[PDB]
Amino acid sequence: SMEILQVALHKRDSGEQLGIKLVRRTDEPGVFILDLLEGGLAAQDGRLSSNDRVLAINGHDLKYGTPELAAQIIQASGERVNLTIARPGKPEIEL
């Protein structure tokens, strides 16, 4: 299973970063959050998480995208940056 959710962050200046480390993976397609940067917009917002898959940013499809394409979109964005995320899997597993 997965959860699909939308997270809107707001840049306080046009050059503000989101505070997200984005990666590609060697065994599945997509752009993924590895982790968030301390004190960044994403961390302050709280919602985004390690292992989230970024499906789109500002309506721009990233399902089969790259970190580079995400970077291009974010750097050119206006103040509102909306990320559509897929969060796979269970939050707790007893094993």
CSV table of N, CA and C in Angstrom, one decimal:
chain,number,residue,atom,x,y,z
A,1,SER,N,0.8,-1.2,0.0
A,1,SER,CA,0.0,0.0,0.0
A,1,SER,C,0.9,1.3,0.0
A,2,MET,N,0.2,2.4,-0.3
A,2,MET,CA,0.9,3.7,-0.1
A,2,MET,C,-0.1,4.7,0.2
A,3,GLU,N,0.4,5.8,0.8
A,3,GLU,CA,-0.4,7.0,1.0
A,3,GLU,C,0.1,8.0,0.0
A,4,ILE,N,-0.9,8.7,-0.6
A,4,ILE,CA,-0.7,9.8,-1.5
A,4,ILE,C,-1.1,11.1,-0.8
A,5,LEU,N,-0.2,12.0,-0.7
A,5,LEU,CA,-0.5,13.3,-0.1
A,5,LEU,C,0.2,14.5,-0.8
A,6,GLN,N,-0.3,15.7,-0.5
A,6,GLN,CA,0.2,16.9,-1.1
A,6,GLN,C,0.7,17.7,0.0
A,7,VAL,N,1.9,18.2,-0.2
A,7,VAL,CA,2.6,19.1,0.8
A,7,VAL,C,3.0,20.4,0.1
A,8,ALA,N,2.5,21.5,0.6
A,8,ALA,CA,2.8,22.8,0.1
A,8,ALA,C,3.8,23.5,1.0
A,9,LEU,N,5.0,23.9,0.4
A,9,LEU,CA,6.0,24.7,1.1
A,9,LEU,C,6.0,26.1,0.5
A,10,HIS,N,6.4,27.1,1.3
A,10,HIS,CA,6.4,28.4,0.8
A,10,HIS,C,7.8,29.1,0.9
A,11,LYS,N,8.4,29.4,-0.2
A,11,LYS,CA,9.7,30.0,-0.2
A,11,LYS,C,9.6,31.5,0.2
A,12,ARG,N,10.4,31.9,1.2
A,12,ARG,CA,10.4,33.2,1.7
A,12,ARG,C,11.1,34.2,0.8
A,13,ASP,N,12.1,33.7,0.0
A,13,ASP,CA,12.7,34.4,-1.1
A,13,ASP,C,12.8,33.4,-2.2
A,14,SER,N,13.0,34.0,-3.5
A,14,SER,CA,13.0,33.1,-4.7
A,14,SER,C,14.2,32.2,-4.7
A,15,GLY,N,15.2,32.4,-3.9
A,15,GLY,CA,16.4,31.5,-3.8
A,15,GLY,C,16.4,30.6,-2.6
A,16,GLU,N,15.3,30.6,-1.8
A,16,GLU,CA,15.3,29.7,-0.7
A,16,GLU,C,15.3,28.2,-1.1
A,17,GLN,N,16.0,27.4,-0.4
A,17,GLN,CA,16.0,26.0,-0.7
A,17,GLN,C,14.8,25.4,0.1
A,18,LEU,N,14.4,24.2,-0.3
A,18,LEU,CA,13.4,23.5,0.4
A,18,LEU,C,13.9,22.7,1.6
A,19,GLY,N,15.2,22.4,1.6
A,19,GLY,CA,15.8,21.5,2.6
A,19,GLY,C,15.5,20.0,2.5
A,20,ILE,N,15.6,19.5,1.2
A,20,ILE,CA,15.3,18.2,0.9
A,20,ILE,C,16.5,17.6,0.1
A,21,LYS,N,17.0,16.4,0.5
A,21,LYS,CA,17.9,15.6,-0.2
A,21,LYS,C,17.2,14.7,-1.1
A,22,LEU,N,17.3,14.9,-2.4
A,22,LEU,CA,16.6,14.0,-3.4
A,22,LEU,C,17.5,13.1,-4.1
A,23,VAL,N,17.1,11.8,-4.3
A,23,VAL,CA,17.9,10.8,-4.9
A,23,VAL,C,17.2,10.0,-5.9
A,24,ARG,N,17.9,9.4,-6.8
A,24,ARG,CA,17.5,8.3,-7.6
A,24,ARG,C,17.9,7.0,-7.0
A,25,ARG,N,17.2,5.9,-7.3
A,25,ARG,CA,17.5,4.6,-6.8
A,25,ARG,C,17.9,3.6,-7.8
A,26,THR,N,18.7,2.7,-7.4
A,26,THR,CA,19.3,1.7,-8.3
A,26,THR,C,18.4,0.5,-8.7
A,27,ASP,N,17.2,0.4,-8.0
A,27,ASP,CA,16.4,-0.8,-8.2
A,27,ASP,C,14.9,-0.5,-8.5
A,28,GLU,N,14.6,0.8,-8.6
A,28,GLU,CA,13.2,1.2,-8.9
A,28,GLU,C,13.2,2.6,-9.5
A,29,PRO,N,12.2,3.0,-10.3
A,29,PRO,CA,12.2,4.3,-10.9
A,29,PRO,C,11.7,5.3,-9.9
A,30,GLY,N,11.9,6.6,-10.2
A,30,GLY,CA,11.4,7.6,-9.4
A,30,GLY,C,12.4,8.5,-8.8
A,31,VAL,N,11.9,9.6,-8.2
A,31,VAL,CA,12.7,10.5,-7.4
A,31,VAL,C,12.3,10.4,-6.0
A,32,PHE,N,13.2,10.2,-5.0
A,32,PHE,CA,12.9,9.9,-3.6
A,32,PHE,C,13.6,10.9,-2.7
A,33,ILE,N,12.9,11.1,-1.6
A,33,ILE,CA,13.5,11.9,-0.5
A,33,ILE,C,14.4,10.9,0.3
A,34,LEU,N,15.7,11.3,0.4
A,34,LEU,CA,16.6,10.5,1.3
A,34,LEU,C,16.4,11.0,2.7
A,35,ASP,N,16.5,12.3,2.9
A,35,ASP,CA,16.3,12.9,4.2
A,35,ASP,C,16.0,14.4,4.0
A,36,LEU,N,15.7,15.1,5.1
A,36,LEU,CA,15.5,16.5,5.2
A,36,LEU,C,16.7,17.2,5.9
A,37,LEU,N,17.0,18.4,5.5
A,37,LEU,CA,18.0,19.2,6.1
A,37,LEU,C,17.5,19.8,7.4
A,38,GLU,N,18.4,19.9,8.4
A,38,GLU,CA,18.1,20.5,9.7
A,38,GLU,C,17.6,22.0,9.5
A,39,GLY,N,16.4,22.3,10.1
A,39,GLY,CA,16.0,23.7,10.1
A,39,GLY,C,15.4,24.2,8.7
A,40,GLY,N,15.4,23.4,7.7
A,40,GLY,CA,14.9,23.8,6.4
A,40,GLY,C,13.4,23.9,6.4
A,41,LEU,N,12.9,24.4,5.3
A,41,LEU,CA,11.4,24.5,5.1
A,41,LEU,C,10.7,23.2,5.3
A,42,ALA,N,11.3,22.2,4.7
A,42,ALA,CA,10.6,20.9,4.7
A,42,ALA,C,10.6,20.3,6.1
A,43,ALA,N,11.7,20.4,6.9
A,43,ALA,CA,11.7,20.0,8.2
A,43,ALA,C,10.8,20.8,9.1
A,44,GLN,N,10.7,22.1,8.9
A,44,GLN,CA,9.8,22.9,9.7
A,44,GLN,C,8.4,22.5,9.4
A,45,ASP,N,8.1,22.2,8.2
A,45,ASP,CA,6.7,21.8,7.9
A,45,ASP,C,6.3,20.5,8.5
A,46,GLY,N,7.3,19.6,8.5
A,46,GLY,CA,7.1,18.3,9.3
A,46,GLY,C,6.6,17.1,8.5
A,47,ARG,N,5.9,17.4,7.4
A,47,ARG,CA,5.2,16.3,6.7
A,47,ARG,C,6.1,15.4,5.9
A,48,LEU,N,7.0,15.9,5.1
A,48,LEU,CA,7.8,15.1,4.2
A,48,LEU,C,8.7,14.2,5.0
A,49,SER,N,9.1,13.1,4.4
A,49,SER,CA,9.8,12.1,5.1
A,49,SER,C,10.8,11.3,4.2
A,50,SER,N,11.8,10.8,4.8
A,50,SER,CA,12.7,9.8,4.1
A,50,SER,C,11.8,8.7,3.5
A,51,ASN,N,12.2,8.3,2.3
A,51,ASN,CA,11.5,7.3,1.5
A,51,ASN,C,10.3,7.7,0.7
A,52,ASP,N,9.8,9.0,0.9
A,52,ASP,CA,8.8,9.5,0.1
A,52,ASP,C,9.2,9.5,-1.3
A,53,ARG,N,8.3,9.2,-2.2
A,53,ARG,CA,8.5,9.3,-3.7
A,53,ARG,C,7.8,10.6,-4.1
A,54,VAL,N,8.5,11.4,-4.8
A,54,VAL,CA,8.0,12.7,-5.4
A,54,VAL,C,7.4,12.4,-6.7
A,55,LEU,N,6.0,12.4,-6.8
A,55,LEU,CA,5.3,12.1,-8.0
A,55,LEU,C,5.2,13.3,-8.9
A,56,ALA,N,5.1,14.5,-8.3
A,56,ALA,CA,5.0,15.7,-9.1
A,56,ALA,C,5.4,16.9,-8.2
A,57,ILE,N,5.8,18.0,-8.8
A,57,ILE,CA,6.0,19.3,-8.1
A,57,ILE,C,5.3,20.3,-9.0
A,58,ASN,N,4.4,21.1,-8.4
A,58,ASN,CA,3.7,22.2,-9.0
A,58,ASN,C,3.0,21.7,-10.3
A,59,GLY,N,2.4,20.5,-10.3
A,59,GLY,CA,1.8,19.9,-11.4
A,59,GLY,C,2.6,19.3,-12.5
A,60,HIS,N,4.0,19.4,-12.3
A,60,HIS,CA,4.9,18.9,-13.2
A,60,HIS,C,5.2,17.4,-12.8
A,61,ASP,N,5.0,16.5,-13.8
A,61,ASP,CA,5.1,15.1,-13.5
A,61,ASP,C,6.6,14.7,-13.2
A,62,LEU,N,6.9,14.0,-12.1
A,62,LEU,CA,8.2,13.5,-11.8
A,62,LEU,C,8.2,12.0,-11.6
A,63,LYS,N,7.1,11.3,-11.9
A,63,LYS,CA,7.0,9.9,-11.7
A,63,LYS,C,8.3,9.1,-12.2
A,64,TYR,N,8.7,9.4,-13.4
A,64,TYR,CA,9.8,8.8,-14.0
A,64,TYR,C,11.0,9.8,-14.2
A,65,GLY,N,11.0,10.9,-13.4
A,65,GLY,CA,11.9,12.0,-13.5
A,65,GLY,C,13.2,11.7,-12.8
A,66,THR,N,14.0,12.8,-12.7
A,66,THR,CA,15.3,12.7,-12.1
A,66,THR,C,15.5,13.8,-11.0
A,67,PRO,N,16.5,13.6,-10.2
A,67,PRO,CA,16.8,14.7,-9.3
A,67,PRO,C,17.1,16.1,-10.0
A,68,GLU,N,17.8,16.0,-11.1
A,68,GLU,CA,18.1,17.2,-11.9
A,68,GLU,C,16.8,17.9,-12.4
A,69,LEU,N,15.8,17.1,-12.9
A,69,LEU,CA,14.6,17.7,-13.3
A,69,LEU,C,13.9,18.4,-12.1
A,70,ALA,N,13.8,17.7,-11.0
A,70,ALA,CA,13.2,18.3,-9.8
A,70,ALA,C,13.9,19.6,-9.4
A,71,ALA,N,15.3,19.6,-9.5
A,71,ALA,CA,16.0,20.8,-9.1
A,71,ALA,C,15.7,21.9,-10.1
A,72,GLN,N,15.5,21.7,-11.3
A,72,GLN,CA,15.2,22.7,-12.3
A,72,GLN,C,13.8,23.3,-12.0
A,73,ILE,N,12.8,22.4,-11.7
A,73,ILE,CA,11.5,22.9,-11.3
A,73,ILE,C,11.5,23.7,-10.1
A,74,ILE,N,12.2,23.2,-9.0
A,74,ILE,CA,12.2,23.9,-7.7
A,74,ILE,C,12.9,25.3,-7.8
A,75,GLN,N,14.1,25.3,-8.6
A,75,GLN,CA,14.8,26.6,-8.7
A,75,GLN,C,14.0,27.6,-9.5
A,76,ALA,N,13.2,27.2,-10.4
A,76,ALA,CA,12.4,28.2,-11.2
A,76,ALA,C,11.1,28.5,-10.6
A,77,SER,N,10.7,27.8,-9.5
A,77,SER,CA,9.4,27.9,-8.9
A,77,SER,C,9.1,29.3,-8.4
A,78,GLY,N,7.8,29.6,-8.3
A,78,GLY,CA,7.4,30.8,-7.6
A,78,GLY,C,7.4,30.4,-6.1
A,79,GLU,N,6.8,31.3,-5.3
A,79,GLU,CA,6.9,31.1,-3.8
A,79,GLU,C,6.3,29.8,-3.3
A,80,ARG,N,5.2,29.3,-3.9
A,80,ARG,CA,4.5,28.1,-3.5
A,80,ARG,C,5.1,26.9,-4.3
A,81,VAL,N,5.5,25.9,-3.5
A,81,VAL,CA,6.1,24.7,-4.0
A,81,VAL,C,5.2,23.6,-3.5
A,82,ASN,N,4.3,23.0,-4.3
A,82,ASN,CA,3.5,21.9,-4.0
A,82,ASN,C,4.1,20.6,-4.4
A,83,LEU,N,4.3,19.7,-3.5
A,83,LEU,CA,4.8,18.3,-3.9
A,83,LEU,C,3.7,17.3,-3.7
A,84,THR,N,3.5,16.5,-4.7
A,84,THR,CA,2.6,15.3,-4.6
A,84,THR,C,3.5,14.1,-4.3
A,85,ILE,N,3.3,13.5,-3.2
A,85,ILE,CA,4.1,12.4,-2.7
A,85,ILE,C,3.4,11.1,-2.6
A,86,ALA,N,4.1,10.0,-2.8
A,86,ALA,CA,3.7,8.7,-2.5
A,86,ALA,C,4.6,8.1,-1.3
A,87,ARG,N,3.9,7.7,-0.3
A,87,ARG,CA,4.6,7.2,0.9
A,87,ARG,C,4.3,5.7,1.0
A,88,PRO,N,5.2,4.9,0.6
A,88,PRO,CA,4.8,3.5,0.6
A,88,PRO,C,4.9,2.8,2.0
A,89,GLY,N,4.2,1.7,2.1
A,89,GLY,CA,4.5,0.8,3.2
A,89,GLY,C,3.9,1.1,4.5
A,90,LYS,N,4.1,0.2,5.4
A,90,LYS,CA,3.5,0.3,6.8
A,90,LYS,C,4.5,1.1,7.7
A,91,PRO,N,3.9,1.9,8.5
A,91,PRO,CA,4.7,2.7,9.5
A,91,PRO,C,5.3,1.9,10.6
A,92,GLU,N,4.7,0.7,10.9
A,92,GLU,CA,5.1,-0.2,12.0
A,92,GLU,C,5.0,-1.6,11.5
A,93,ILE,N,6.0,-2.4,11.7
A,93,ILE,CA,6.0,-3.8,11.4
A,93,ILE,C,6.6,-4.6,12.6
A,94,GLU,N,5.8,-5.5,13.1
A,94,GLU,CA,6.3,-6.4,14.1
A,94,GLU,C,6.9,-7.7,13.4
A,95,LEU,N,8.1,-8.0,13.7
A,95,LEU,CA,8.8,-9.0,13.0
A,95,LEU,C,9.8,-9.8,13.9
